[PDB]
Amino acid sequence: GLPVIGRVAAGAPILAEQNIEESCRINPAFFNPRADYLLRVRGMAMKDIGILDGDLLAVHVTREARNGQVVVARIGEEVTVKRFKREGSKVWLLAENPEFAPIEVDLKEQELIIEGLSVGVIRR
Amino acid sequence: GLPVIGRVAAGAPILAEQNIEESCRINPAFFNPRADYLLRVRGMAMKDIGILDGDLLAVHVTREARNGQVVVARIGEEVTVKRFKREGSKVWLLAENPEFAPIEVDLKEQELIIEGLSVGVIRR
Amino acid sequence: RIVEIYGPESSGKTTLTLSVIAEAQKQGATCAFVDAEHALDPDYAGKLGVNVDDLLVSQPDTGEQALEITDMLVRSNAVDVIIVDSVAALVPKAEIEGEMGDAHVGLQARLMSQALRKITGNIKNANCLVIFINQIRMKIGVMFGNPETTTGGNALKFYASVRLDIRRTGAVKEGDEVVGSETRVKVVKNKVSPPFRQAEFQILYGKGIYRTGEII
Amino acid sequence: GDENKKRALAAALGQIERQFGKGAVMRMGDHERQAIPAISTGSLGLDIALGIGGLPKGRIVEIYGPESSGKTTLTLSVIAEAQKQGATCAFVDAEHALDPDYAGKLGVNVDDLLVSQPDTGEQALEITDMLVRSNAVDVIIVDSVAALVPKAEIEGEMGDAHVGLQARLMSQALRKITGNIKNANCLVIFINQIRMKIGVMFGNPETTTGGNALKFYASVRLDIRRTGAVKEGDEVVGSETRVKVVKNKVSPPFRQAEFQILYGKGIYRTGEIIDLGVQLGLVEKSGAWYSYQGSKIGQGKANAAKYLEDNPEIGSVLEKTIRDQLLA
Amino acid sequence: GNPETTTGGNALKFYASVRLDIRRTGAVKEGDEVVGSETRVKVVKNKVSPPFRQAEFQILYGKGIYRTGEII
Amino acid sequence: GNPETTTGGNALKFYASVRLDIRRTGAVKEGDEVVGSETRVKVVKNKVSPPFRQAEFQILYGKGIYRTGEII
Amino acid sequence: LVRSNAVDVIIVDSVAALVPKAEIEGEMGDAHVGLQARLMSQALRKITGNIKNANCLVIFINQIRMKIGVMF
Numbered sequence A, B: 001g002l003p004v005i006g007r008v009a010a011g012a013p014i015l016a017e018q019n020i021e022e023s024c025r026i027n028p029a030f031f032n033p034r035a036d037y038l039l040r041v042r043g044m045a046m047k048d049i050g051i052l053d054g055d056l057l058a059v060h061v062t063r064e065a066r067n068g069q070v071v072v073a074r075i076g077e078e079v080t081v082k083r084f085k086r087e088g089s090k091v092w093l094l095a096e097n098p099e100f101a102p103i104e105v106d107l108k109e110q111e112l113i114i115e116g117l118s119v120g121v122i123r124r
Numbered sequence C: 001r002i003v004e005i006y007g008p009e010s011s012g013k014t015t016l017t018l019s020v021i022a023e024a025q026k027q028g029a030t031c032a033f034v035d036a037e038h039a040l041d042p043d044y045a046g047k048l049g050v051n052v053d054d055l056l057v058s059q060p061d062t063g064e065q066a067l068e069i070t071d072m073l074v075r076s077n078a079v080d081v082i083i084v085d086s087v088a089a090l091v092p093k094a095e096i097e098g099e100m101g102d103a104h105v106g107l108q109a110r111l112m113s114q115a116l117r118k119i120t121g122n123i124k125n126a127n128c129l130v131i132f133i134n135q136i137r138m139k140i141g142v143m144f145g146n147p148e149t150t151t152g153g154n155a156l157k158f159y160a161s162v163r164l165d166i167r168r169t170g171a172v173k174e175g176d177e178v179v180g181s182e183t184r185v186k187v188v189k190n191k192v193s194p195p196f197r198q199a200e201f202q203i204l205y206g207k208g209i210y211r212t213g214e215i216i
Numbered sequence D: 001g002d003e004n005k006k007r008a009l010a011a012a013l014g015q016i017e018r019q020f021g022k023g024a025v026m027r028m029g030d031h032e033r034q035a036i037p038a039i040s041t042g043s044l045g046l047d048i049a050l051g052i053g054g055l056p057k058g059r060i061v062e063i064y065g066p067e068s069s070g071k072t073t074l075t076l077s078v079i080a081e082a083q084k085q086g087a088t089c090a091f092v093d094a095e096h097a098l099d100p101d102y103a104g105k106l107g108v109n110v111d112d113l114l115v116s117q118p119d120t121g122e123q124a125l126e127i128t129d130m131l132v133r134s135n136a137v138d139v140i141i142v143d144s145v146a147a148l149v150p151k152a153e154i155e156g157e158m159g160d161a162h163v164g165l166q167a168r169l170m171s172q173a174l175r176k177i178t179g180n181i182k183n184a185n186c187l188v189i190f191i192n193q194i195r196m197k198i199g200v201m202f203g204n205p206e207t208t209t210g211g212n213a214l215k216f217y218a219s220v221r222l223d224i225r226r227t228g229a230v231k232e233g234d235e236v237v238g239s240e241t242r243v244k245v246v247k248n249k250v251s252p253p254f255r256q257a258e259f260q261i262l263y264g265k266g267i268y269r270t271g272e273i274i275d276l277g278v279q280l281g282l283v284e285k286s287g288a289w290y291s292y293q294g295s296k297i298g299q300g301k302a303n304a305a306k307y308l309e310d311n312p313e314i315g316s317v318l319e320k321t322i323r324d325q326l327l328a
Numbered sequence E, F: 001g002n003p004e005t006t007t008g009g010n011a012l013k014f015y016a017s018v019r020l021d022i023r024r025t026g027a028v029k030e031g032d033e034v035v036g037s038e039t040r041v042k043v044v045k046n047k048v049s050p051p052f053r054q055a056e057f058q059i060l061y062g063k064g065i066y067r068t069g070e071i072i
Numbered sequence G: 001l002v003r004s005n006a007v008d009v010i011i012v013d014s015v016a017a018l019v020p021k022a023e024i025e026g027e028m029g030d031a032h033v034g035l036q037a038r039l040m041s042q043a044l045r046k047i048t049g050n051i052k053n054a055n056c057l058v059i060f061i062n063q064i065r066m067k068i069g070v071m072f
């Protein structure tokens, strides 16, 4: 199954809602971390990693983030995909593109919630 | 009901029985060209487009190309996935790497085998 | 038009509604505050500047009674502002009558939808301004997106002409004691102008909202 | 015009009165109470902090804090204070943890105390609702909101997926109880438990249990914690506490108050009055020598407490004066 | 399935010649402020051509539907 | 019971020699866009052969019913 | 191995060398403090019962690492 439940922004964060767009037909455990839903990508931030624009991205629901692994951050009502890197009261959302300057988020001043970690891309 | 061509033996048909690993990595053929088998592309020959060491890529069995259209071309003993570029009587296996120059193969002395069309890539 | 403003606990919803009531009374209008959870300190309201003696307060026991009282006041063509203290507290009559922990799912939602359907037509004719104050309840199974979800069914968000989202961010202190709290109001919906015009201001305890610093 | 508006308003109000009752507009002059009726909480720290000199009557109250912080002892002190006033109080507990001998030691007249220990969560809420509707019991204390297990959860086996089941029960129970309390002028106190949440990623991770439908109705929410311990050289006989009024609807919030809890003897009000009076000025100490009206009351807090205990009227005068200067 | 369900009974869905389904997915911002919203109309019923031909278009407050963006 | 009932009174279910109950369960989508629907027809009543012989077949927009599919 | 109940004497040499996977990809010098301890605790909690059901004998081998701070 893995119904698509919205779209993530590869770059500047954009609003994200839970509404199901469509239902795919790939078995739930096709991915190693057992991806639960596919989040449509939008942008060119992760082109250097093989995630171009308009390529369904599988996400695994995880609240814990480890440095160096791509996650789906959610700032306020905006959700974006970036590499996670935290060294204290500040968090950097590195982007695999010279065009997109890394994003600095201070946990003390602004709440940061991680939607999960990416496990693959479909590119149908 | 989709075959996973993971192990590509040298001198073996694109859809040999030994070439299929299965392992329950089976999903339905919902791709538009309706790919009939999944081929894992190995090598950085298409890093610019999104091809990597894994990136299970679905291929639809068909013999046709037009302009800059990627296809699975067989050189007899080696299976590779490169872009197609007609030259009238010679075909160029265009790739996307500063190091991987466009491979020139021609047709009068050798005719490339169009195993199938490259539509969709599954990083997994 | 219906206006519905929600936000977490101690965010400033009742204070904002009381400030609106004060403005309406100062302009020379009659206002009626139909409390829901029987939570209101008339001394504090008087402090904010609203003339309590001119204000109509209700303490409805069940949800149907409160909604009917609001409809009656609206039809009267007398009251220009009506505030319902909470929408989560409008307990349906059946639920209160029945035993605890029953599967009375949807009763409050149907009650709210019916009340809105009946009231929206009279409000425009009567030129009133009904303000619904709603609470925040985390929706389970949302996963992706904002878990926050207002209570009292999802029929109020279609009629609500302008929905606010008021949250309490900071705390103003004289070195050691807190005397007021920073607030951030975000217009999450609107039909009379562009939405998403977040605006920040201060709420000093006792003195109401701090318009003077806002002007500066 | 304006006369027409007034006539229409009068007609509507009269019809509302005739159909529902005398509940459309409160009587103006009647509802003018100098202060909201409050139940003293056994300590000047909280009486001053709350502003109305005690927990407001007719409103849910919520006190939570880490393990062995001092929630149950505070609730028992409140119950004893109410009983001395002359109102019936009911203690309904869910963890089935209560030492009536110790409660009587604190000061509660256990002989007259309706203690219920329901076997299920729904039953506890039902008992509280019945008691509230009875208009007889004046103070109701429901202990360990985290221990109200829903009947469905008990019927099921350990490990079943019952996510969010208890929050529904809590929200529904409050939705029904809140209305009756104001009419009955009761005072319901809930005792939550701190249960750190996950994925906070920074800042205060503490999170109260029992869903978040209780923090909207709760008229005043405390946060009671234990800072240190009072030791007579080798043994510990009491623990210092720090109650912070994290939410309030009758006075400005965040009026942190501090005081000691002495085992068996209950709250140490005699020391708190001295502490307040010394900084106010009604009691003078030249650095480390306690004095009062130019008289060396003695040397030491215990000494000052004994000097005040020998003369109860002296203590009551200071307690009245400090309240009249700070509370009002 | 989908718990979502239109209102006003289910007698209208039979007579409805063509039933759309507008949803506002994204938001369009000029730097920081929102000036429009991203819709996504899905023809979920049709008696004049095959259904489910969803189309996306950007709507700008005050200016109406952004046709010039669609045309490009 | 089953709340779903037909309209137009119940004088038609007596005279009706054979009554079908055609429902559209699945949707045959070629690639990404849908091109047909998976219907199922159940003969709820019949006066010329045994009832309840539910049959399934595919319906393709524009061309009609996909006879070759179920023939194969 | 323990699940199969075939091998009945399992020796795990150099507990110290069980570098966690999530740290192998991490760069050198990253303050991944406690990851290995969490891994070991999870593993012990997961395989402390299967040993009993079998007769295996899992023999770990640790190493001495002087600690700093208090030296009573």
Ligand SMILES: Nc1ncnc2c1ncn2[C@@H]1O[C@H](COP(=O)(O)OP(=O)(O)OP(O)(O)=S)[C@@H](O)[C@H]1O
Residues within 6 Å of the ligand: D066, D067, D068, D069, D070, D071, D072, D073, D074, D099, D102, D239, D263, D264
């Ligand atoms: N019977 C008792 N004898 C002596 N000390 C007691 C007794 N009961 C409680 N205490 C102490 O009183 C202090 C406050 O504990 P209580 O508030 O009475 O219980 P509690 O800790 O609030 O309940 P929990 O488990 O924290 S929800 C602690 O230091 C306890 O050790």
Ligand SMILES: Nc1ncnc2c1ncn2[C@@H]1O[C@H](COP(=O)(O)OP(=O)(O)OP(O)(O)=S)[C@@H](O)[C@H]1O
Residues within 6 Å of the ligand: C007, C008, C009, C010, C011, C012, C013, C014, C015, C016, C041, C044, C181, C203, C205, C206, D215, D216, D217, D247, D248, D249, D250, D251, D252, D253
């Ligand atoms: N009597 C009072 N004295 C001082 N401060 C008060 C009083 N009543 C409310 N406040 C404060 O006013 C601010 C706004 O809260 P209110 O609007 O009065 O209550 P509230 O926001 O409705 O809380 P809920 O749970 O949403 S109803 C908060 O910081 C309260 O602590």
Ligand SMILES: [Mg+2]
Residues within 6 Å of the ligand: C013, C014, C015, C085
């Ligand atoms: Mg309020």
Ligand SMILES: [Mg+2]
Residues within 6 Å of the ligand: D071, D072, D097, D143
């Ligand atoms: Mg206790």
